[PDB]
Design a protein around this nucleic acid. Structure first.
Ligand SMILES: [Mg+2]
Ligand SMILES: [Mg+2]
Ligand SMILES: [Mg+2]
Ligand SMILES: [Mg+2]
Ligand SMILES: [Mg+2]
Lengths: 41, 144, 190, 206, 263, 113
RNA sequence: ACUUAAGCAGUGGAGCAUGUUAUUUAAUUCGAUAAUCCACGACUAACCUUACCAUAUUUUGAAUAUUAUAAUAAUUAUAAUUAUUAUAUUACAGGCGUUACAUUGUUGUCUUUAGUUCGUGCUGCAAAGUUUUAGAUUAAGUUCAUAAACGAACAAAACUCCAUAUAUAUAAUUUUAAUUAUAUAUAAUUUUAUAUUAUUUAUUAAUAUAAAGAAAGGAAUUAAGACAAAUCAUAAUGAUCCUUAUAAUAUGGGUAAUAGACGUGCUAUAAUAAAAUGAUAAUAAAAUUAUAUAAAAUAUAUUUAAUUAUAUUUAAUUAAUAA
């Protein structure tokens, strides 16, 4: 799916699974249940 | 009523087969598929193609069906490989090439082929390379 | 059998003519044809295959398994509609349809069913009779699994000129069906 | 014995293939699965925002021939002359684009020629898979069918006995099939024509 | 026929033709599609054919779906379509008709490429090569070649033939008198054919050589053939000759009907 | 830093988990190092050659990393990543094999009669 | 009426194999516990598998997207743009973490499935009932009878598919097993004629005799309840928890330790039973061989040979052909 934007610029493809994952991250983001920031080396 | 020539009539009947004159076996065509309807239809088409190409073809000899079985722990699953055989006799290699190319052009789904060609004719090392290189290398040549 | 060239020329396209010539010289005239048994290569009907039927034959330009068109010569560029429309009338209706709006109220149904079942005149029922519901209630029955509710309707119908009838109807599903049954019974009890 | 009155047992399987090289057959099955999932992912199309069309398509039928692959699938969608909507662009990139159409990339993927065949279904209850994916977001007929089949059989019988009363080759083909024709035989003999039952997903067609 | 690619030639065409060419160019070009002057001017003429105002077609051309937006579920069944399964059956019949037409009107055109079978004269063409071709597959066994020859037709005298058979070892079968060799080591089948032919020339050359060769006193070994035959069932027996009694055979009976029908 | 394994290996095209990734790494590295390992084994197992070369070959064989060994490759389900009850005819565990056979994804498979 | 009681055939005290439990262990990865009994998945655990222990060791990691610097190309014109490929970039990815963290999906176990609704008709003022019948028959829903009840839909049955017996086609009987192979088709739920005994008494069952029969077995296919589940390894989604650690890689170890305890199998405890031998080779079926199989031969155990096990060497076969 990553390759599609390069191949077919006119057509705009929505991958539903990534939208669901992003919305779930936002939902956990809203309630402060987000993952702790990864330690910088 | 409406004239219907011989070609259209031949479609509505079993494929015509040319007689074998000499008896030389030039090509064996084995068709195998997991279902039989497509298999027999394609065999019939090959027979018609061979007839119109002038190729004596014996016919689709039924060969033993292979049965693969699997057990899921107790459900039984199985796959049947149906196999047909068509043999070609007394014709030139070029005509076999035309037959095979044409029937490959118009093949049917789910059917696989093997073509064995008999050509009567007149009487008249990657690992090894690597082993030599290692033996030349200065980790093995240093032990001579 | 064998036909002379002109007779086929008038009755067949020119391109197919050369195929028919080669078939004529290829198939002996004394040929005997035996029907096949295991595999039916030909259609059940009779056809000379000269013309392409839009429904029963692969559409020209449509990609498919046996597409003989060059891969980039397909002529299907608008995908909005169903590509191959239905043949014949354009419809697939069963021998008798029964859809009054898609085939290719209480008073009306009461009148029709009553004329069908007892011979009563529909027009008299629809025009002259008037219904007023008298009793409308919910009655329950206990059962081992649970309590089951039903709707009871008692209605009175009459033409206001000396004919009056009483009808009772029960329905577990809806009160409207109970009123329908009560109207039916009241018409029967005139 | 007739292809208008039965469904080929080959059509039962989504990937219909036989290869002498069994490893290539397994590879083709895996490729069919993965490409089917990718085709599933490509079926949603939005134009800017608030224009999210979702095409529901059944599972793909991968017809493997010796010199070609055909990916057949059914799909549901939903002044039109002078522009292109998202679904039309999707199909045109499936087959019609000159430069980087999908079937060329799939041909490089499979190492054999590839074509894609989308077919539109104007309703949702004409396919169990499409119907299920969408909702995620008769005795007279039989009597007529049997009697009419008997009519065709008896008509061929009548033609043959008449031809006999006027090897096993009998006579001209036209007299054998005097009245049988494209208009009357095909549509009448076809099966699975009407939906006679359903249970929301199992659709019974007879 | 190159109408769609060059913008210059839409003028004067039937309206449906301009519309189809417009669709063709746009669909084929895809992302590389760009507006053109002549296509728009030709599309201006198509306003009469269909129910569209001129400015409306300009707008639709300019801005796609959204320009048109700025300007169903569980629907009743109209009996205008088939189920998917019935459509599969119709596809089967479409394939059947395609093949029927093909056999009807193209296969008769393959007779022009007929050629007579010049039989390779049996004695002077005794070596048969088997090549295998798995059509439409990359099968490693496509490289195997089999060279088989009935040893009698080899041009050899008794001592040379006996040497040939002795040196063949397991590759020679005394019962069927066949010498068969299989080669699949090289990548292609032609390389294996050359390999087999060269080995045959070596074997023949040194079998024909009897100058310093004394393999007459070595009996031919058949233990491999003995085992191969021992791994098969035999139906050698036959009905005893003396047991046959032709006297009791069915005797055909006279029937005058066919006599008069034929004479 | 960027990748768990010493050498860059492309991602499998289907279901992914850690054990599938390790399996794929070992498989690809076996592909690359097969010829070298076979040559080393030949030099080690060839009694014609001097003993010193045989011992050198054996020591070099022992020095190789684990992702080059042939035995360490284990067949895993390509749909769930399970390593047991894997059918090599489809490279699926018995459960995934069952579901795919019921759904018709496997060509030619049917229910037993 | 499951299950029991009876009859028959066994197995059953020992050794080993293989599980579970206990105990130990650094770990001996995971499984049950509301009082009969039950923690018990193995289509192969040396490494991998692997999930456990020890020691080191990796930190945007496996993906998606953002925002930036480097090379590659394509164009325009060194620059502009596009892409690709790296390096960062942080949302995060990841988790064989948790069922005392829940709900669907299902996976099974048990019961009921000639029965449940719907439509009419009829009885009762009505809630309701649908009646004889709480019938007969069979080994059993397999079959009848009656009566204000009669219908349609599912379900069941029929039907379907195996097996069997035949017919047609196909095979130039060297891919030979034509005694075979696989396509189509037919056939049966057996049909009859009498005798005797019962019978709702014949236009019925029990048998038995005679006649035509190749005809004698089998599987699948539906819903409704109710219980059990996290090796629910039969999954998904969500809840919560870790984010230098409960994530990830490598080396080795462990899953095989034994006082014991109980299951499951294999080998035995001798003569209605074990051993040796039995080459023109007594007699099969179903499988498997491109990530192979390994024939015959030579050599060593070893000894005239044979047998058996390895070694050397690959003959054919990628297959109705050879193994
Ligand atoms: Mg292993
Ligand atoms: Mg380890
Ligand atoms: Mg281990
Ligand atoms: Mg997570
Ligand atoms: Mg873990």
């Amino acid at each position: 799916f990553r390759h599609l934007k390069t191949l077919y610029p006119d057509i705009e493809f929505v991958d539903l699974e990534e939208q669901y994952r992003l919305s779930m991250v936002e939902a956990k983001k809203r309630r402060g249940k987000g993952a702790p920031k990864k330690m910088k080396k | 009523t409406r004239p219907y020539p011989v070609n259209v009539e031949a479609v509505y009947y079993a494929p015509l087969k040319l007689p074998i004159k000499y008896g030389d076996l030039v090509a064996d065509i084995q068709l195998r598929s997991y279902d039989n309807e497509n298999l027999d239809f394609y065999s019939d088409f090959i027979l018609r193609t061979g007839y119109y190409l002038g190729i004596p073809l014996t016919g689709p000899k039924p060969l033993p069906t292979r049965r693969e079985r699997w057990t899921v722990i107790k459900e039984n699953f199985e796959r049947h490989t149906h196999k047909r055989l068509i043999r070609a006799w007394d014709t030139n290699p070029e005509v076999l090439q035309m037959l095979i190319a044409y029937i490959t052009k118009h093949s049917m789904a789910g059917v696989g082929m093997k073509c064995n060609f008999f050509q009567r004719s007149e009487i008249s090392s990657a690992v090894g390379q690597k082993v030599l290189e290692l033996l030349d290398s200065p980790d093995f040549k240093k032990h001579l | 059998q064998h036909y002379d060239e002109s007779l086929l020329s008038r009755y067949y396209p020119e391109s197919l003519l050369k195929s028919i010539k080669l078939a004529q010289q290829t198939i002996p005239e004394d040929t005997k044809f035996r029907v096949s048994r295991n595999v039916e290569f030909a259609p059940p009907y009779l056809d000379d295959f000269t013309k392409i039927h839009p429904f029963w034959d692969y559409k020209p330009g449509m990609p498919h398994l046996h597409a003989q068109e060059e891969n980039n010569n397909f002529s299907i560029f608008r995908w909005d509609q169903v590509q191959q429309p239905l043949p014949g009338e354009g419809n697939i209706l069963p021998p008798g349809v029964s859809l009054p709006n898609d085939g290719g109220s209480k008073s009306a149904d009461v009148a029709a069913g009553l004329h069908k079942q007892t011979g009563v005149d529909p027009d008299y029922i629809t025009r002259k009779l008037t219904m007023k519901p008298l009793v409308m209630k919910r009655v329950s029955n206990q059962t081992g699994k649970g309590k089951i509710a039903s709707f009871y309707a008692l209605v009175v119908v009459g033409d206001k000129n000396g004919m009056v009838g009483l009808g009772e109807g029960k329905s577990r599903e809806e009160m409207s069906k109970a009123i329908f049954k009560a109207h039916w019974d009241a018409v029967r009890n005139l | 014995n007739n292809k208008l009155q039965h469904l080929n047992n080959m059509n039962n399987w989504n990937t219909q293939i036989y290869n002498y090289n069994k490893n290539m057959e397994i590879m083709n099955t895996m490729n069919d699965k993965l490409i089917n999932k990718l085709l599933y992912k490509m079926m949603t199309l939005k134009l800017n925002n608030m224009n999210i069309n979702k095409i529901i398509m059944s599972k793909t039928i991968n017809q493997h021939s010796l010199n070609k692959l055909n990916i057949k699938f059914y799909y549901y969608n939903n002044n039109n002359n002078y522009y292109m909507n998202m679904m039309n662009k999707l199909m045109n990139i499936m087959n019609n684009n000159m430069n980087n159409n999908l079937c060329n990339i799939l041909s490089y993927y499979y190492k054999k020629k590839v074509t894609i065949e989308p077919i539109k279904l104007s309703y949702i209850y004409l396919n169990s898979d499409i119907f299920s994916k969408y909702i995620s977001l008769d005795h007279n007929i039989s009597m007529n069918y049997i009697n009419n089949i008997n009519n065709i059989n008896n008509n061929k019988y009548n033609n043959m006995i008449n031809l006999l009363n006027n090897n096993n080759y009998i006579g001209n083909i036209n007299n054998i099939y005097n009245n049988m024709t494209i208009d009357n035989i095909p549509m009448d003999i076809l099966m699975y024509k009407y939906l006679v039952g359903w249970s929301i997903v199992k659709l019974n067609f007879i | 026929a190159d109408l769609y690619m060059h913008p210059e030639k839409w003028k004067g065409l039937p309206p449906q033709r301009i519309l189809e060419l417009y669709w063709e160019r746009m669909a084929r070009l895809g992302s590389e599609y760009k507006p053109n002057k002549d296509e728009l001017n030709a599309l201006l003429t198509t306003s009469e054919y269909s129910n569209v105002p001129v400015n409306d077609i300009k707008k639709l051309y300019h801005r796609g779906e959204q320009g048109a937006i700025d300007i169903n579920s569980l629907r009743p069944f109209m009996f205008d379509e088939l189920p998917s399964q019935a459509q599969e059956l119709v596809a089967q019949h479409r394939e059947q008709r395609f093949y029927n037409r093909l056999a009807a009107y193209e296969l008769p055109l393959l007779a022009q490429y007929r050629q007579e079978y010049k039989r390779p004269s049996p004695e002077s063409h005794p070596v048969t090569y088997r090549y295998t071709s798995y059509v439409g597959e990359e099968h490693p066994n496509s490289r195997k070649v089999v060279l088989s020859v009935k040893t009698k037709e080899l041009g050899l005298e008794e001592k040379s033939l006996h040497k040939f058979r002795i040196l063949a070892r397991s590759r020679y079968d005394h019962t069927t008198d066949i010498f068969k060799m299989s080669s699949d080591k090289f990548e292609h089948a032609s390389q294996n054919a050359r390999y087999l032919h060269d080995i045959l020339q070596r074997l023949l050359a040194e079998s024909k050589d009897l100058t310093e060769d004394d393999f007459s006193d070595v009996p031919l070994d058949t233990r491999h053939t003995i085992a191969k035959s021992l791994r098969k069932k035999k139906r050698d027996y036959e009905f005893p000759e003396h047991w046959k009694r032709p006297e009791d055979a069915p005797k055909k009976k006279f029937d005058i009907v066919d006599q008069l029908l034929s004479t | 830093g960027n990748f768990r394994f010493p050498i860059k290996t492309k991602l499998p095209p289907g279901f992914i988990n850690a054990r599938i990734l390790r399996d794929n790494f070992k498989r690809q590295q076996f592909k690359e190092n097969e010829i070298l390992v076979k040559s080393l084994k030949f030099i080690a197992r060839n009694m014609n050659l001097p003993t010193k070369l045989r011992l050198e070959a054996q020591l070099k064989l022992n020095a190789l990393p684990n992702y080059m060994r042939s035995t360490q490759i284990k067949n895993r389900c390509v749909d769930s990543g399970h390593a047991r009850f894997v059918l090599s005819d489809f490279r699926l565990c018995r459960y995934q094999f069952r579901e795919n056979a019921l759904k018709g994804n496997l060509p030619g498979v049917k229910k037993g009669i």
